[PDB]
Each structure stands twice: as structure tokens, then as C-alpha cells.
Amino acid sequence: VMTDPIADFLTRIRNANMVKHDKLELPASKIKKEIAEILKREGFIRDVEYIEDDNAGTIRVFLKYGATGERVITGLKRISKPGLRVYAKSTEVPKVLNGLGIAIVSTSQGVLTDKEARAKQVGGEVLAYVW
Amino acid sequence: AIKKYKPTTNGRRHMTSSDFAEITTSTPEKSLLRPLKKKAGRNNQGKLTVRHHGGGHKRQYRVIDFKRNKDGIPGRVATIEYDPNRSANIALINYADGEKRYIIAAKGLEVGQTIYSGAEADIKVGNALELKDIPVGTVIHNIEMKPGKGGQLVRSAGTSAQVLGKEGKYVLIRLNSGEVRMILATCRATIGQVGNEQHELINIGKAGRSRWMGKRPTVRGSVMNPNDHPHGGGEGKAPIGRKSPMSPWGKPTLGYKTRKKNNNSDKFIVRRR
Amino acid sequence: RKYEIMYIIRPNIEEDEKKAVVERFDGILTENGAEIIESKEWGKRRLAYEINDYRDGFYHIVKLNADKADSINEFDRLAKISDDIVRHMVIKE
């Protein structure tokens, strides 16, 4: 969290995915909140709980695996990096893995996945890819 | 230390001189001054015997205690002065007796220190003791060769001797040139090295500065005439066309020993330089 | 700060003189900026090696309270000059 607490957040998911862990916790923030809720809407996360603390609270995330020991979140990549910010126009929002994946966009009407941002015709900074 | 000179003119290009950081006063005691007259190497009969002398800045002799027989009376250093007759600075001492006299300034001696001498003095710079009482190995100066005559062996600037061992009635000594010698144990000496140790690093840098000090030009021999020097003559430049280089009076002058072969004092010299 | 002194006096000193140097040596410490807590002597003690032509000697132990620290340096200067004390060491406490 030295510079980018979203790039770190994605990494903390990927590291614990590789070693087949089950739960993981990390300090909470308003932007970290819904980015963790979106992943619940597509089953990428088993469930999420919030914790209230003295400094800012933390967020506990229950990662999900399919039976037969197959991972569900197979990777994450960041696009808006603090060293180089990227913005995408409405018609030029990409599709990840021909629509199998999901992307996160911080449009003008709250953080939104591009399934409906293209349906709502808005663009904004592109936060991450998930696939 | 040494005061170098910026290269203003060609005569000042290399000249260096001492800065006199140590001389305290510049007014000699008027009661210890005796006149001198230059002699320019002129003989008893008015002839010129030792050449290349005479014709310098005038000076004034200033009496110096080379005996230090005033025993047991505390003496105090009053100043360190400049003396033109020698290569070392000198110091003015006023004993509690009220008398004043000059002594040679040994290295490390500074104004305020108190000097004793005799047969009960301690071992410190400036104290005068017989070689009988001097512990072996110490560094001394101003030795003397006959009991009671006065200091005569080590006197120039920044030089020292070393008591090397006692052999009964005599005492072994290593002199400055490196010649180990034997002298009577009732003679005297002064502990410590002589003061002005940097006197030998000075560039004269000018002919005029040579002549300010009572020195006159030296002419080589190869440019003289055949009747004037065993080398003079020959057309053009000529080498030393002789068996050996010669002084203006025969008597070869390079590698030729000239000590008297039948001297009385061979048995007091353990080894030469 | 806290200091401590321990010096050695030649055995060939008659007890009249050996009781005088202690007043002299302890004189400087009180004279300059320091205060002495006590001055005790162990007594005669054999030396593990012949420091000088000697073989035996006397021992002493002194405690101080000083702040300007110049008293110790004055004690150091007189120690080497004197011909009585052969070895002396200063330890901080």
C-alpha cells in the first residue's frame, strides 16, 4: 500500500489463490469496498464480511473454489497504474476473454462492470481485468 | 616553519626563508655585546690565506656561556633571540642571583621554564651535568673535551649526540657524524637536541643573498690559466687531463685521506664515520 | 560522572613519607573540581612481574565526584612527572 492500494489488493488475492488458501483479510476503504462486492456478484468470491476496527476497519474475504479442486479466479491484471493512468471511451471499452472475463470501470455513476457500462453508454478509468 | 615566496620576479622565483615564529624579543642585552671586525680571510701578515670570504653585512658579537658552571641556582628563560654569528637561536637567562647570560637554545625550550645545573639537577632539557651522572642512552649536546674548558663538541643547529656507555674513567659517545668516541667522565654536557632544526631547508635563491652573508664568488679551475691551477689551460673546453683531480696546490682532492697518520688521539676513537 | 583512581607507590618509602604522598596526591583532586569519597590502601602486595627493578609495592583506591573533569587531567600530568607513583589507571564508573 506504499503507492497503489488497488494493485496491492489484486496481488493479495492472486498470491492466496496460488497456494489454495481459503480466507484473507486486509484494511478497508471506500473504493476497496465495492470492488470486493462486484466479485461476489459473479461468484468469484464465496462471500465477504466487513469488520469494524479502531483505525479504519478491515474486510474479510472468503475465496471460493469449485469442487474437484479447480480454482475460480485464474488471474488478475491492472491497467490504470499510478505511473500511467488509462481512460477508455464508451465505444472502446474492451471485452475480456470474449466476454468470459470481467472488467471494472469507475464511470461517472459509481464503480461499474463493463457489462452494463457499454449498455449505459459511459466510459471512465479502467481499473482491472479479471479472468 | 618556512615562508615560501610567490614567484614575482626571476630573482624571487625560488627564494624561501624562515618565518621566525619563535624569536620573542628583538633587542639584545646591551651588557653582553662585544664588537667584531670582519677579517675577510686576511692573515696575520695581511696576506689572503682562506679564500672566498669577507664583504658582508656588519654584525656584533654576543657573549655565550659554554661552561655553565653556575651550580645550584635556579635560572629562568627570559627570551629566545636571533644571533647572526651561528646557526642556532640563543636564549637569555636571568638567574635568581641577578646575573644574566646567554645559552644555546635547545629544541623544546620555551619561555618560562626553569633551568638548573650542577651535580644535583634533574634530567630535563637545558640542565647541565657531568657525563658521570648522565644516565646511559640519553641525548645530549654541547659536550666538552677537557674538564672545565667549556662546551666544544655539539653546537650547530638541530644536532645531537648520544651517551652510549660508561667504561670506568671514560664515557663512550656517538657523535653527530657517526664517529663513536671516548671522552673523560668529568666533562659536562646539556640534555636535549639543539633548537633550530629547519635551518637546512632554505633556498638562497639569489647571488646577492649569498653575498649578504660574507661570501665571495668561487671560480672553477678548468677556466683558469696553466700557471694558475693544475687544471687550467687547453683550447676549448678540456677535461681533467691528469691522473687524478687536483687542488690548486697539488695534493689530490677526491678520495685522498688527509688525517695525520701518527696522531695521539687514535686510541680514543673506537670507530670512524 | 563517576571515576576511580588506583595507584602504586614504591615500597622503599618509609611510612612517614608514604603517609605524606597520599595527602599530596589526594590534595589535587579536592583542590580542582572534584570531591573524594574516601582514600583507602590495600597494603603491600606482590607484583605479577617486575615493573621496574622493584618487585613489591603499595596499593591505593580512591573514589571521586567530578564534573569539569579537569581535575583528572591535572592528576594525570603530575603522575608521570613524579618519581613515586609507578603505575596508575583511571576507570570510569
Added chain:
Amino acid sequence: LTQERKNEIIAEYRVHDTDTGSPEVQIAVLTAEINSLNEHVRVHKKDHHSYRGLMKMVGHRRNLLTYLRKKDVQRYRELIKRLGLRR
């Protein structure tokens, strides 16, 4: 600096009774140490290792100054005069 010397300094710069890390109290002490060390580094000029510690302190003094100069310009323009520094 002794511990007791510092507690004399801090009592002359605190805002309320027990603050100990406000920029002005934090810089009042460091300036005293910097002045103290320079008089101890202008005698022994070959102590290169210890001289570096002086550079860190003046580096840590300057960073706090720009804090005041962007937080309260009036306060900073006042502190210098009392402390006798420059810009």
C-alpha cells in the same frame, strides 16, 4: 546535549503543556544540537564519519520548515525570528 539540557529547551517552545513533537518544538531542539555539533566539528576536522550525522540533522531540519511554510505561514514567519534562523 544532556537530557536535562533538552528539558530546559522544550519548556520554552511548547504550545500546550505536554506536546513534544510539534514542528516548532521538534525544530527548536535540533537547531541547538546542530549549533552544538558544529563547534565540536570545527576543532577535529578529520572526523568524517561523525560529520555525516550533522548532514542528516540539517536535512531533517529543512523538511520540517517547509511543513510550517505550507501549514501556517504566520506561525513560520514568527518562529524564525525567535529561533534566529534564515530562509
Added chain:
Amino acid sequence: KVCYFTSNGITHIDYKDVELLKKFVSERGKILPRRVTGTSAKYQRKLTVAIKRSRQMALLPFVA
């Protein structure tokens, strides 16, 4: 094994206790290593400084 200092309750050091210090010096006067005397690692430095400072003031021989 077992450090005497770490066990026998002796915590401080004074360079006057020559008799106690003599247990840690060899026959020829050398300092024993750690592997034979069993002293703790920390007190070894306390002991090593103690002997040397005494060894200067004639309480123990340099070479015996």
C-alpha cells in the same frame, strides 16, 4: 557447560577480584576459550575486558 556467572548469581565485575578471575586463566597465562570454560557468550566480553585491564596493573602476569 553451564556458565558460572549466569548461574552462581555473580552479575557485576570488578577488576580487583584477582582470585576469582584466576579460575578463567590458563597455566601459561592465556585466556581460555569459550568451548572449555562454559561461560556465556555475553559475559565473555565482560570477562575479557576485565582480565586485560587487570593484566596491565600487575595483578596478573602477561606470560606467567
Added chain:
RNA sequence: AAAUUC
């Protein structure tokens, strides 16, 4: 002891 080249 040292003791090269194809």
C-alpha cells in the same frame, strides 16, 4: 631441484 617444441 628446474626440464622446451610438433
Added chain:
RNA sequence: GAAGACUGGAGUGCAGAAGAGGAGAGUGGAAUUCCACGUGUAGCGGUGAAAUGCGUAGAUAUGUGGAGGAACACCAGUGGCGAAGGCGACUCUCUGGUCUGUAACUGACGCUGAGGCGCGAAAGCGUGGGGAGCAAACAGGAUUAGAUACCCUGGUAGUCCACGCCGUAAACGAUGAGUGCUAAGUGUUAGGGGGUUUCCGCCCCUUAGUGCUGCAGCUAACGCAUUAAGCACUCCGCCUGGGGA
């Protein structure tokens, strides 16, 4: 961007710990060399063999004392400290940094950092001291077909100290700085905490260093593997066939 709020980052306070960190002055003991004096006789030294060398002006050896210089036996330990070069005798004076515990205080005061400024082994240079060993150059004896070398006897600059330059190295962990995350096992350095436990001693928890063995992962391979060369973010330096260079 503006205004305001918060304490984890960063820093101060408070209580402790260890340290060949540094500058200056003073001091110590073994040992090589030299000098002086006793005892005593023909050799001592050196190599693969030998010779040069030193000795009957009396050597080598041996006892007593004096002088000078340089480095610090044991402790000593993939131990400590420092940003890197580097730092071992002892004492004192003047100084720098680091770690643990507390939650008293400030409230993002942070990280990197082109140009710029400093420090930088050894050799080398200038001025000046000093000079015990060792030792470029060089001389002598050897070796060999030749031996400007390796071997042997000497030996100048130097090695050391003060002031001023040089600014380089396999200056190497051949691994830029900062931050977070990802199985274990076992040593060792300085700490804190608990259990057992009258103590001592044993067991357990934790922080910061320092070694080794090893999963997931990486790599071309060797190997790295919580002290990453694994998974990520910020900033800096550098590379684009070999020679020419």
C-alpha cells in the same frame, strides 16, 4: 485544487541494551634489529645440492642493561559495528548511528532523486619528519641451451606520521533504493513476554539481525527460495553482434 477531520506511515517524548563505529591525547607487554659489558671457541648462516655472506680486530651461542620503529599472541566466533571503502593492546576527553519496550505528543510532515556537493582500499605525487623489519629498482651467488625470472645473501624509493593532491579496483552478494503479500525445519547475536519453577535450569510466544536444509513459484541450466533471482506498485542507472576501442 480548496476547506475540515483521523492515526497505522513517518518523527518526537519516556525506560533500557549491545557494539574492532569515529577524532585527539596519554599509556603497556612479548618479539625482530642495533649498541655496551661479562663467559666461552671455531665456526654461524643457507639450498634440491652449492656458493655469495658474516667470524681469530674473536663470531653463532649465552646473562645483564640501554635505544628506535611497526603491528597488537590467547580472548576469536559463516561473531559485532558502519552507507560503501573499512574498523582488534589499555585508559580518558569529544562525538555519530541502531535495536527493544511504552502510547505521552505532532498528524501524511513520505519515497525515489537527473545536474550539484561530499566520503572513497592499495599503488602514486608535493613539502617536511621518521626509518625496526619487510621490500619495486639494482649488485653479488646460483639454475639453465639462453634466465633481464622463480632459489640464496644484501638493498634505495616505499611501507609509518602532519598538511595538500590523485578519485581508481574482481570498489563482488558480480544481485539499485522503498513498501506489502506467499508452507516449514534448525543454529547463533541483542531484546521483551508467559509458563514450569523458592532459585538455578528447562518449555513456550514475539521483535530486529546473522547462517544452513528445503515446498509453492521462477529459471536456459547451474541455482534462488521470508536475508527471492517468487507475486505486485513508485522512482533512478544502464544494454542492443565480436573486433576497431
